[PDB]
Amino acid sequence: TVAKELRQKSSEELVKLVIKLKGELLEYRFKLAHGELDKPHLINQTRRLLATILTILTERKLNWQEEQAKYKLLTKKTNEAAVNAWKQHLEANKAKLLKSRAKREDASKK
Amino acid sequence: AKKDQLTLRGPLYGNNRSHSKTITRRKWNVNLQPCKVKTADGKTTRILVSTRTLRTLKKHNRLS
Amino acid sequence: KYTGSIFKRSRRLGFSLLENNKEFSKGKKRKTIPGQHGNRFRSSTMSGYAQQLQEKQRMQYMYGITDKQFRRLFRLVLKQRGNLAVNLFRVLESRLDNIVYRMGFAPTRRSARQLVNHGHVLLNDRTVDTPSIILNPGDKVRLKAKTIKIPIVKAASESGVVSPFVETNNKTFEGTYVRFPERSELPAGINESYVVEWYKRLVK
Amino acid sequence: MQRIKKGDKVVVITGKNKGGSGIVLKIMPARQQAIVEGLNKVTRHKKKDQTTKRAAKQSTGKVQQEAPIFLSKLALFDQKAKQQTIGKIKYVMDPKTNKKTRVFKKSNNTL
Amino acid sequence: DVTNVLLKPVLTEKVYFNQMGETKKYVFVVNPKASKTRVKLAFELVYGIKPLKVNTLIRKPTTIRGGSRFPGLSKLEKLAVITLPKGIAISVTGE
RNA sequence: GGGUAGGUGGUAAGAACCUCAGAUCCGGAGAUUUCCGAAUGGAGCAAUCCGGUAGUUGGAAACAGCUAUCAUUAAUUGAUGAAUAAAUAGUCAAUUAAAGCAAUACGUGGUGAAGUGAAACAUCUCAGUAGCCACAGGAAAAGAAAACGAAUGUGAUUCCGUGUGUAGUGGCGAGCGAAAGCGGAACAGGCCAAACUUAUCAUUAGAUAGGGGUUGUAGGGCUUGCAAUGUGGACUUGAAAACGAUAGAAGAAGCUGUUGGAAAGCAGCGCGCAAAAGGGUGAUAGCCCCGUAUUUGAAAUUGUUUUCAUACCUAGCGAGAUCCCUGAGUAGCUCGGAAAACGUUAUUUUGAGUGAAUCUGCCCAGACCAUUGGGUAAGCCUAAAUACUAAUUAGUGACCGAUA
RNA sequence: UGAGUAACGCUUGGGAGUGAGAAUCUCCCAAACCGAUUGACUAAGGUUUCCUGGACCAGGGUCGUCCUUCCAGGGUUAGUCUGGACCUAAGCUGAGGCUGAAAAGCGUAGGCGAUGGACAACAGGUUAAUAUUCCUGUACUUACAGUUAGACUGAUGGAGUG
Numbered sequence A: 001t002v003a004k005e006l007r008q009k010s011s012e013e014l015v016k017l018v019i020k021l022k023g024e025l026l027e028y029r030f031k032l033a034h035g036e037l038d039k040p041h042l043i044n045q046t047r048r049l050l051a052t053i054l055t056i057l058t059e060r061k062l063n064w065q066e067e068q069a070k071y072k073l074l075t076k077k078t079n080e081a082a083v084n085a086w087k088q089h090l091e092a093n094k095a096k097l098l099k100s101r102a103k104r105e106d107a108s109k110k
Numbered sequence B: 001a002k003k004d005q006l007t008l009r010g011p012l013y014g015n016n017r018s019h020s021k022t023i024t025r026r027k028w029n030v031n032l033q034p035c036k037v038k039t040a041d042g043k044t045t046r047i048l049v050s051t052r053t054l055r056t057l058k059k060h061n062r063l064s
Numbered sequence C: 001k002y003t004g005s006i007f008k009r010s011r012r013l014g015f016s017l018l019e020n021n022k023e024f025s026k027g028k029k030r031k032t033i034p035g036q037h038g039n040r041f042r043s044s045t046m047s048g049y050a051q052q053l054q055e056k057q058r059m060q061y062m063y064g065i066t067d068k069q070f071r072r073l074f075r076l077v078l079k080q081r082g083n084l085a086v087n088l089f090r091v092l093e094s095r096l097d098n099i100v101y102r103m104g105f106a107p108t109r110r111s112a113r114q115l116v117n118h119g120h121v122l123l124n125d126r127t128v129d130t131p132s133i134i135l136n137p138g139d140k141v142r143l144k145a146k147t148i149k150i151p152i153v154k155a156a157s158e159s160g161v162v163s164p165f166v167e168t169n170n171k172t173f174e175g176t177y178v179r180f181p182e183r184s185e186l187p188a189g190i191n192e193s194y195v196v197e198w199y200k201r202l203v204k
Numbered sequence D: 001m002q003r004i005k006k007g008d009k010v011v012v013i014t015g016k017n018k019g020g021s022g023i024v025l026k027i028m029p030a031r032q033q034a035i036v037e038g039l040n041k042v043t044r045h046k047k048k049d050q051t052t053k054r055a056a057k058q059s060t061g062k063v064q065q066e067a068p069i070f071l072s073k074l075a076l077f078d079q080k081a082k083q084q085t086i087g088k089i090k091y092v093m094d095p096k097t098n099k100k101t102r103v104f105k106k107s108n109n110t111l
Numbered sequence E: 001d002v003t004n005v006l007l008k009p010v011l012t013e014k015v016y017f018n019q020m021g022e023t024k025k026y027v028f029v030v031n032p033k034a035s036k037t038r039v040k041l042a043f044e045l046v047y048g049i050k051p052l053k054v055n056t057l058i059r060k061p062t063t064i065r066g067g068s069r070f071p072g073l074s075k076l077e078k079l080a081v082i083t084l085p086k087g088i089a090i091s092v093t094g095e
Numbered sequence F: 001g002g003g004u005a006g007g008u009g010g011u012a013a014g015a016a017c018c019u020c021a022g023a024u025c026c027g028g029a030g031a032u033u034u035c036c037g038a039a040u041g042g043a044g045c046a047a048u049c050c051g052g053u054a055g056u057u058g059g060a061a062a063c064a065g066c067u068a069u070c071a072u073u074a075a076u077u078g079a080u081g082a083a084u085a086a087a088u089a090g091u092c093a094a095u096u097a098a099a100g101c102a103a104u105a106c107g108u109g110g111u112g113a114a115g116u117g118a119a120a121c122a123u124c125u126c127a128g129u130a131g132c133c134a135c136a137g138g139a140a141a142a143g144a145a146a147a148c149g150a151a152u153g154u155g156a157u158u159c160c161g162u163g164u165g166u167a168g169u170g171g172c173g174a175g176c177g178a179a180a181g182c183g184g185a186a187c188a189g190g191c192c193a194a195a196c197u198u199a200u201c202a203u204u205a206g207a208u209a210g211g212g213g214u215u216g217u218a219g220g221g222c223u224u225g226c227a228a229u230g231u232g233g234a235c236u237u238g239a240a241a242a243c244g245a246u247a248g249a250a251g252a253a254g255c256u257g258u259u260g261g262a263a264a265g266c267a268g269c270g271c272g273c274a275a276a277a278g279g280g281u282g283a284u285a286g287c288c289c290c291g292u293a294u295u296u297g298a299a300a301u302u303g304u305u306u307u308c309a310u311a312c313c314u315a316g317c318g319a320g321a322u323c324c325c326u327g328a329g330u331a332g333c334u335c336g337g338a339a340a341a342c343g344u345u346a347u348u349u350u351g352a353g354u355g356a357a358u359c360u361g362c363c364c365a366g367a368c369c370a371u372u373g374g375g376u377a378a379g380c381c382u383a384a385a386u387a388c389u390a391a392u393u394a395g396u397g398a399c400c401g402a403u404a
Numbered sequence G: 001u002g003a004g005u006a007a008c009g010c011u012u013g014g015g016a017g018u019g020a021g022a023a024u025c026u027c028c029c030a031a032a033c034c035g036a037u038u039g040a041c042u043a044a045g046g047u048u049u050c051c052u053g054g055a056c057c058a059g060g061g062u063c064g065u066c067c068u069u070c071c072a073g074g075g076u077u078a079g080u081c082u083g084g085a086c087c088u089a090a091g092c093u094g095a096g097g098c099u100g101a102a103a104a105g106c107g108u109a110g111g112c113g114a115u116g117g118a119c120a121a122c123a124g125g126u127u128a129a130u131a132u133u134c135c136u137g138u139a140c141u142u143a144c145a146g147u148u149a150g151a152c153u154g155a156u157g158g159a160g161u162g
């Protein structure tokens, strides 16, 4: 029943489906680990649909990891705060580095 | 092992009968004697063989 | 038990003894062996009996029999009244599958036997699965209805062709007979009676 | 097919309850049981347990529920017939819809 | 890459003691066959902030439910301690 | 495919879902199948560690993901190539097979004791048993007479009964014990070498690939004719049909009263049967339920048999020539052993030595010679009857019923 | 039955508290022994016996509200520490190969094999349980890329040191 609709779908859309369901499965398991999953059956439904998608993708002599590795889209949003913290951390590290080298150098000159 | 390389005939185990018919297991060994032959362009290769194959080798003109 | 290297030893001699016994030249003969064996015969000079022996093979083959079963049937008929050269003919022709093939609903005798064994065959005072029961001259052999439910029908036609000692009505699937086959209906493929005297020597 | 389904009217033919009319709410095929409402009312001695948000109250006194009954003791109830009676059923296949339907053998009533 | 090496986050007193005071330290359970680099890569592809360093713990199996009619052993756990840079604190739940 | 109205494996209630676009469940066919383990990239203290190579994606590279491959031996082929000119050894690469396990069971072969008995013990027995090892197979082994054996005789092998505890063999002691014949189960006989001939190899062939041949009342080859186009196989591909195996469908007949907690017991009056096997249902049910007898059904996989065609094999009786071929370190013999019932001996086998002949030939018929007769060694393959049950289905038991 | 007998396997007093119940549990004050050790750190081994809370079926040679017992939860953070990714000793394995009825034995090249050799982090603080590992402070080592300046680079082999 569900497999027929998936059979009509192409391969590229199917690997998009598998990566999206993998992410949702991770989120469901994390929410369950925080005791915030009201519906505990969606984990099983996700895994069965994931298993079914693997069956249709393995019917054709095609993999699921390599095909998405060939073409993909990058990430976004999680960049601004990240670069702020890294810039802050490296500036402090270089400041400490500069202070140490100065202290050693002026000490050796004296 | 103590066996010919041309054929596969090996030792023969039997009894050592003496007076009073006392039984003791003994071993007959084949006469492995070195021999050189000419095969495949006359290539000489020392081969430990039984005297019987050596007599067989001598009559068959191989040994020259 | 090492690097025996059959090339090393075989070429080592090129004739010797073991090579020639083994000589890879060894062909297949996978048809010479079977076929000639198959089955033979002919007549010879020193024993005479050669003619009798060959006739037995033909006779036994005509009905697809193993020699042991034949010895049983001969033992049965041997003892009775007298010169029974009229009895054993009825006995040899009383096979149910033989009657089924002679009845005309099978293309060949062995196919009829297969049918009989596969449970196509309905009898009178009984029913039948084994294709070896010895039948009585005046017996009926009503054919099943499932067989007609599998129309291959081609058979019914052969039935009418028939031979005079069997009376069978086509399509209606029924059969019986009387006036057991005379020697005319047992053609010259096998028509002799000194194989009969031979079986008294081999079978008491 | 099945002799007893979830929903059809049924009566009891043996035991204390004779002519005990009820509606089957659920069928356990493995244990050959059948829960019929209004019959075999048992009253478990309800304890008190408080270990959950709902268990903080869990008000349970003399709750009378339904005990399962062996499917052999059950018999289908006729409704179409003017004189209702207890009988056995067939498994005829009508070619109109090619679906199996139960029919009584002492009458001609479907299901 | 496949991100099966991030099974479940764990929250204890030690974890909450670390998850305060500037740099936060988040403790997850990971694939026992995974390496530190795989843990960092999984965190890269699913959260977006590079860990400052990663520490690993292996908890050995021990007998559990001792004395019960059928005794059983524990399960092998590998713990991972991610530490994000100064001033960044992301939520484990909510994406 | 079957099959439904329930399902989410047991200790197991509850929470939360799925399910009439046909769920769960059963059957057939597939997909995925972590690590160790023959384990086989290298190692290693099993389920661990450390990699190489060729790709591909990120990185500025180290690097990190995602794939495939990388053991050894044997055979074939190709390349390269030492001492040493050639050539090999060796080296490399490719392809094809082998590794291991189990059925506390059957087979073959090698090796192979002792307790014990003989009222001691050494010959002997135990026993070619236990054990160890190698190789299988679904059975294996054996197998088509250089045979039995004493006759106007039988005519591969295997297995059962008898012959009989007989002839014999035994410190003639303990003991051991056939081979003929007869009655049965099953039955099947084939194929190479050599002659002769064809083609090719610096044709020194003495080698390769073909035609011809497979024997004993001798066969075959050489030359010359007649009759033959068939019958049959241990046989290849296909097509068709039948009988099954792996899920299932249908499947008759009862109420009343009484004791009783409860009827199915008991009693009254009935009913069905190709179903009175069994199980359950609050006691002991042919008619309450599931079933059973009986009639049936398979999309898919698989087994047996048959028919048709189709490759591949398969064929008689004469004449003349008097020529050729018929399995050699072989059969015999000697020295030590063994197998057969036999404690070594006519027959079979072999560790050492020696060593023949070629149908007017050779072997055999319990030393041996002659006559008579039987059979054709030193080449190969062979179904069936025979041995066993770890497993699958159905079933049975004057077998057990928690110390059995 | 012996028999409620032998035995209960080196260490005191008191005050307060908990508790239904205290010579045996908690706290305090003493007291007595160890003090080249009954003190502290670890190897091997043990394998959760470690921390918190609860319980007193069973076990504790008595008792027990208590336990190294049981239940539930938690606890072990490394470029620098101990070992691999480095090296070898005794020894093991060991393609080829030799030997041997079979199984196998020996053994070359290679590979393993520390109890040895080489290798960069110290001080303090923090939790009930981890700390050269977490935190603070100050350091060091090895790789890769870019860059600046100088220089010709020099091993699978030889030699010295080790």
Ligand SMILES: [Mg+2]
Residues within 6 Å of the ligand: B023
């Ligand atoms: Mg002895």
Ligand SMILES: [Mg+2]
Residues within 6 Å of the ligand: E056
């Ligand atoms: Mg660590």
Ligand SMILES: [Mg+2]
Residues within 6 Å of the ligand: none
């Ligand atoms: Mg279906």
Ligand SMILES: [Mg+2]
Residues within 6 Å of the ligand: none
């Ligand atoms: Mg003895």
Ligand SMILES: [Mg+2]
Residues within 6 Å of the ligand: F117
């Ligand atoms: Mg004795």
Ligand SMILES: [Mg+2]
Residues within 6 Å of the ligand: none
């Ligand atoms: Mg065989």
Ligand SMILES: [Mg+2]
Residues within 6 Å of the ligand: none
């Ligand atoms: Mg049914």
Ligand SMILES: [Mg+2]
Residues within 6 Å of the ligand: none
């Ligand atoms: Mg019925």
Ligand SMILES: [Mg+2]
Residues within 6 Å of the ligand: F285
């Ligand atoms: Mg009954």
Ligand SMILES: [Mg+2]
Residues within 6 Å of the ligand: none
């Ligand atoms: Mg002789």
Ligand SMILES: [Mg+2]
Residues within 6 Å of the ligand: none
């Ligand atoms: Mg003997």
Ligand SMILES: [Mg+2]
Residues within 6 Å of the ligand: F359
């Ligand atoms: Mg002769």
Ligand SMILES: [Mg+2]
Residues within 6 Å of the ligand: F376
């Ligand atoms: Mg001959």
Ligand SMILES: [Mg+2]
Residues within 6 Å of the ligand: F402
């Ligand atoms: Mg027992």
Ligand SMILES: [Mg+2]
Residues within 6 Å of the ligand: none
């Ligand atoms: Mg007991």
Ligand SMILES: [Mg+2]
Residues within 6 Å of the ligand: none
């Ligand atoms: Mg006592």
